[PDB]
Amino acid sequence: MPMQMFMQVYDEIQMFLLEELELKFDMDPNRVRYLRKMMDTTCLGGKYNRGLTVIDVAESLLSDGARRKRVLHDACVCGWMIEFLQAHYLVEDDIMDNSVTRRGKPCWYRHPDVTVQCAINDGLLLKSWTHMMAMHFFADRPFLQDLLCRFNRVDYTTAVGQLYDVTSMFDSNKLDPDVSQPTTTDFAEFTLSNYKRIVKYKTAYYTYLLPLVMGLIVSEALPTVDMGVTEELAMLMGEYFQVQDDVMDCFTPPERLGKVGTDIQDAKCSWLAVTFLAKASSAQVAEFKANYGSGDSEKVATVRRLYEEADLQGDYVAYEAAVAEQVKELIEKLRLCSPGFAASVETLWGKTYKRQK
Amino acid sequence: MPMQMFMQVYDEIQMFLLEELELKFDMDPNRVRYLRKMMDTTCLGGKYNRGLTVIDVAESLLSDGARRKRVLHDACVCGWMIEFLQAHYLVEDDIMDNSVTRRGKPCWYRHPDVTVQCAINDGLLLKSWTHMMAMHFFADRPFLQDLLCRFNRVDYTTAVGQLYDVTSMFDSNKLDPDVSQPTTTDFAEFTLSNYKRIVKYKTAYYTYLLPLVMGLIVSEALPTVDMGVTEELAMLMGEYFQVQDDVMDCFTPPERLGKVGTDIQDAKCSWLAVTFLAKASSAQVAEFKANYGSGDSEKVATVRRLYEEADLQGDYVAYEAAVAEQVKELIEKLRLCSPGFAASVETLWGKTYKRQK
Ligand SMILES: [Mg+2]
Ligand SMILES: [Mg+2]
Ligand SMILES: [Mg+2]
Ligand SMILES: [Mg+2]
Ligand SMILES: [Mg+2]
Ligand SMILES: [Mg+2]
């Protein structure tokens, strides 16, 4: 069931936005057709984890089926706010990460009839739509203000996180707009500390905290949960998820994943890189520095091999297990006063722990 | 005087954002200092006509000196919201328009130490700072919701206008993501009707309507004015402003302007091009078609010559006159019920009409 009504609302939403364009922005049917394809391609075909989580939270907490309908519909709308938000990021990220492929098909910027400049802007329409749907559907809702603030906070934080990511390979001390600079040769910034920061901000907020929050908001239950504990859950779960993403980038075949990995080529401060650099021999570190941040497939393979040789699958297992127990305890801390919420967090973790995506 | 306080508030705003980044986002000094440079370079050095308008509306409309202080400070914050919004759009426009230079210096994405990926994200940071500064300064402010909503609406409209601009040279009939397509060779879409659509949406709203409205809101005076007339003015003054932009792109020396024109090279649907094409001989038109949308300087120079030869300067003078008096009529309608507001609108017409910039 969750999915049936979700897609039901996708169509309401989509209809509202396109019709609004035609009626109020003087839009010709070609561009309207174009933007429909852009919407479907950029927003559909994922697993909808963030949007579904919102609904799930709404459901779990509603422990006069008219309220039920209102809460569930709102939850769906928030659900798509996040998915459209996600979509926006992904459109821009792929350009920034110079990716080729996404969800089994070419990156939006790589579609044959999509110029790079139009993709950038298509990415922005996407973000605007999150506001547009919110304003329409929640016009007369006493929570729209708070909703919108929180949502802008997360978005900002995500943007900030992306700065961390996109500059993780330059020596921060030499980071000056006026002066050109090459990629770091010493990698002194590839530390777990910096890794954790990138990920907390680029991924944990919008992927884990935000959907929990929006589910609570549409259900008028925000004050009923330990937020400090809710926030730790999200920070932990989101870090692990990003770490999973980093591993898959490297070691999962693109056909399962939907996308070809660029973290090595782009010289990303991935979990692998940082965990590798902290335990590795000088000899290994040296071979790494010699092969990292390069298009060349042999170099890419070498980096992959160093990772295998340094037994990073060792470290991952241990990290994972360590995440799982902290998560288990915090869920129980939350179950004391918040049982319904706590169950949906458990489901969310269910979808994370050992995901094969 | 207005300018004295506007820059005090800039510091205030800047000091708040950067400190937040430090205290709440775990930001290191290097990135902090990068972000300060980015902020200054993208938000300063222009003329601030959008920002200053807001204050002037505020000041006009005032008709215990503490409300005055509150309303004025609020107006500066609003003024910077639009200037930061403008800042965002320009970072992204310059990339999309492939421009070289802006406000006397290289485009942000062209700064030696700014990568393209990072500029795109810096533009997004700029946008989010409009929300954040609002959230902060207006937290206890009954109008914050109305403001954010109106602001988002306009922002979205600008994005829609930008799509009109960026696709204006493709046969819209063939516009499909899945299939590549070269520049239109027939230019059927280079009509004044389509031109008017581009410009209404990409420039008029944020540049003219939005400063006026913001001034009204913080003055708590929105309902005192004929909004349908206000909008008429803004659309008019906005179209004419963009017509002026298009012309200078072509015939103003880069040094007076602070930027190099790209409209010819980008094959943009500028006012000149529509105006030329509707009146030129078939021969002239063939020539234009041979030379438009190419970086080659001789081809670029030919086009310039075609525009001069077609006496577009007669068409401009006429348009200006018609606009000028159509505006004058509408101001007087407005002066009737709201003479304080109407004055600030005339001040604003005063900074547009015959601008050299
Ligand atoms: Mg990335
Ligand atoms: Mg990526
Ligand atoms: Mg990845
Ligand atoms: Mg443009
Ligand atoms: Mg431009
Ligand atoms: Mg221009």
Complete DSSP assignment for A71-131:
HHHHHHHHHHHHHHHHHHHHHHHHHHTT--EETTEE-GGGSTT--HHHHHHHHHHHHHHHH
What is the greatest pairwise CA distance in chain A? 70
Q: Beta-carbon neighbour count of residue A95 at 10 Å? A: 20
Residue B249 annotated as binding site: yes
Name the pairing type of β-strands B101-102 and B105-106. antiparallel
For residue B355, give the DSSP letter. Answer: -
**Resolution, Å (one decimal):** 2.6
Q: What is the DSSP letter of A293?
A: S
Q: Give the gyration radius of chain A's Cα atoms.
A: 21
CB A149 within 8 A of CB B137: no
Contact B247, B271 (CB under 8 A): yes
Looking at this protein, which amino acid is placed at residue B275?
T
Angstrom distance (rounded) from CA A205 to CA A19: 32
> From the list A120, A179, A197, which residue is nearest B113 (CB)?
A179
Question: Residue A75 C-alpha to ligand 4 middle, in angstroms?
Answer: 37
Chain A: residue nearest B179 by CA? A113
Residue of B nearest to A162 (CA): B121
Residues 6+ apart with CB under 8 A from A243: A199, A271, A316, A319
Give the C-alpha separation, B261 to B263, whole Å: 6
CA distances, A87 to each of A39, A103, A247, B149 (Å): 9, 11, 22, 22
Interface A-B, measured as beta-carbon pairs within 8 A, has a size of: 176
- Distance (Å, whole) CA A268 – CA B52: 43
Q: Residue A354 and residue A350: Cα distance in Å, rounded?
A: 9
Residue found by looking up tokens 């589910």 in the block:
A215
Rounded to the nearest whole angstrom, what is the distance from the C-alpha of residue B94 to the centroid of ligand 6? 10
Element at B164 (helix H, strand E): helix B144-166
Summarize the annotated binding site of A for Mg(2+) as residue ranges.
93-94, 97, 165, 245, 249, 263
- What are the DSSP calls for B31-63, one per residue? HHHHHHHHHHHHHSSS--HHHHHHHHHHHHTT-
Domain of A316, CATH number, reads 1.10.600.10
Among A111, A301, A141, CA closest to B181: A111
Secondary structure letter of residue A6 according to DSSP: H
Domain span including residue B232: 1-357
Quote the minimal CA–CA distance from B42 to chain A in Å: 12
Q: Which of B113, B198, B239 to mutate to test the interface with A (most CBs of A within 10 A)?
A: B113
* Smallest Cα distance from A2 to chain B, Å: 30
B34, closest residue in chain A (CA to CA):
A176
For residue A97, give the chain B residue with the closest CA.
B117
This entry's atomic model was obtained through X-ray
Cα atoms in the 13 Å half-sphere on the side-chain side of A17: 32
Query: Which of these, B106, B107, B91, B88, lies nearest to B154 by C-alpha position?
Result: B88
Compute the C-alpha angle B281/B283/B286, nearest 5°: 115
Residue B106, H or E segment = strand B105-106
Determine the Cα–Cα distance for residues B137 and A254; give it in Å rounded to an integer: 47
- Record the tokens describing residue B12, joined without a space: 């205030």
- Cα separation, A159 vs A144, in Å, equals 22
Ligand 2 centroid – CA A175 distance (Å):
22
- Distant-in-sequence, close-in-space partners of A146: CB < 8 Å, separation ≥ 6: A217
Q: Rounded distance, CA B18 to CA B25, Å?
A: 10
Using CA atoms, how far apart are residues A92 and A329, in angstroms rounded to an integer? 37
Residues with CB under 5 A from ligand 2 (ion): A 93, 97
Which residues does chain B have within 8 Å of residue A26's beta carbon, measured at their own beta carbons? Answer: 197, 200-201
B43 contacts in chain A (CB < 8 Å): none
User: Contacts of residue B124 in chain A, CB cutoff 8 Å?
Assistant: 92, 159, 162
Residue B106 β-bridge partners: B101
Asked if B121 and A180 come within 8 Å (Cβ–Cβ), the reply is no
What amino acid is encoded at B203 in this protein?
A: T
Query: CA distances (Å), B85 to each of A263, B16, B50, B108, B158, in order?
Result: 32, 18, 10, 15, 10
How far is the alpha carbon of A181 from chain B, nearest alpha carbon, in Å? 6
CA of B93 to the centre of ligand 5 (A): 5
* DSSP string over B221-281: -GGGS-HHHHHHHHHHHHHHHHHHHHHHHHHS-HHHHTS---TTTTT---HHHHHHHHHS-
A27 C-alpha to ligand 4 centroid (Å): 18
| Ligand 1 mean position, distance from CA A169 (Å) | 12
* Largest pairwise CA distance in chain B: 70
Three-point CA angle A240, A244, A249, nearest 5°: 150
If one counts the domains in chain B, the total is 1
* Residues in contact with A270: Cβ distance below 8 Å, sequence separation at least 6, in sequence order: A195, A246, A249, A250, A263
Task: Nearest chain B residue to A145 by CA: give it.
Answer: B145
User: Which SS3 state, helix, strand or coil, does residue B105 take?
Assistant: strand
SS3 annotation, A296-348: CHHHHHHHHHHHHHCCHHHHHHHHHHHHHHHHHHHHHHHHHHCHHHHHHHHHH
Please report which helix (H) or strand (E) contains residue A50, including its range: helix A49-61
Contact A209, A238 (CB under 8 A): yes
Answer for the pair B87, B119: CB distance below 8 angstroms, yes or no: no
DSSP B206: I
C-alpha to C-alpha distances, A241 to A197, A206, B209, B281, nearest whole angstrom: 14, 12, 44, 63
